Amino acid sequence: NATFGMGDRVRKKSGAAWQGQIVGWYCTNLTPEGYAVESEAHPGSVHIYPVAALERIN
Amino acid sequence: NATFGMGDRVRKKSGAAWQGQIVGWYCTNLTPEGYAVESEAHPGSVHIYPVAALERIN
Amino acid sequence: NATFGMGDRVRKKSGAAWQGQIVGWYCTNLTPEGYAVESEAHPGSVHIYPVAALERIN
Amino acid sequence: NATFGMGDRVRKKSGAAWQGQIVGWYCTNLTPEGYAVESEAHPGSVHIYPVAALERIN
Ligand code: NA
Ligand code: NA
């Protein structure tokens, strides 16, 4: 039931910015659906965010 | 061919410390096999590391 | 007018946990008063947070 | 004796990329001279690095 798949382009909706491709997944009690996103601006740098923080873009 | 699975207890081998359970996975060109690890000391806090940075513990 | 000083013991108030000593400072438009905190559980690992996310403890 | 000052434009020398302005400082035993850098590509997002990881650019 994953919202995003590998390679989707996503951005953070608000606050500190982040944008790039989905490169992984994680799950905790605090964040039952989380994603790893590699920056499209800073190759190799990856952030993890809850699904609710992210939106898919073209 | 994953080295670790969900729930394995791992620690960072050197440098800044980190220890807890595997909670996810990611893959980039820089890090073709990476893991998300939730701290066992700081619930909810998650770091991502390359496989080579981590070792499984009891 | 800094809320915390070097060496203060602080914790994150909510969400993902973090606890340890103040080891630095930063300032952005999003976070005009921010602090670096070295984990007391994971030596060497440092997170940065806005002041509003942190509280001083004994 | 700080290598960089607030507002210097810096980049990470190798590995995962990062580039933007110095916005803060930190010091630990592992990293006796560290800096906070706000991405110029992703406003509001800040990483911390040891001085040896960074170089000043125009
Ligand atoms: Na991380
Ligand atoms: Na950082």
Residue numbers in the entry:
A (entry chain A), B (entry chain A), C (entry chain A), D (entry chain A): 21 to 78
Give sentences from the paper.
Plasmid-encoded bacterial R67 dihydrofolate reductase (DHFR) catalyzes the same reaction as the chromosomal counterpart but is highly resistant to the widely used antibiotic Trimethoprim (TMP) unlike the chromosomal enzyme. Dihydrofolate reductase (DHFR) catalyzes the reduction of dihydrofolate (DHF) to tetrahydrofolate (THF) employing nicotinamide adenine dinucleotide phosphate (NADPH) as a cofactor.
The structure of Q67H mutant of R67 DHFR complexed with a non-specific inhibitor Congo red (CGR) has been determined at 1.15 Å resolution. R67 DHFR-CGR binary complex crystals belong to the space group I4122 as in previously determined structures. In the Fo-Fc map, one of the two naphthalene moieties in CGR is clearly observed, however, the biphenyl linker and the other naphthalene moiety are not seen owing to flexibility. CGR does not utilize its twofold axis to align with any of the three crystallographic twofold axes of the tetrameric protein instead, it binds like the asymmetrical folate and NADP+ at any one of the four symmetry-related positions in the active site pore. The naphthalene moiety with exocyclic sulphonate ion and amino group, interacts with residues 66–68 from all four protomers via metal-based ionic, van der Waals, stacking, and hydrogen bonding interactions. Amino acid residues Val66, His67, and Ile68, with their symmetry-related partners form the immediate vicinity of the bound sulphonated naphthalene. In striking contrast to bisbenzimidazole inhibitors, Congo red does not use its symmetry for binding and the sulphonate does not interact with Lys32 or YTT cluster. In our work, CGR is bound asymmetrically between two anti-parallel β strands in the active site pore with no changes in the protein structure.
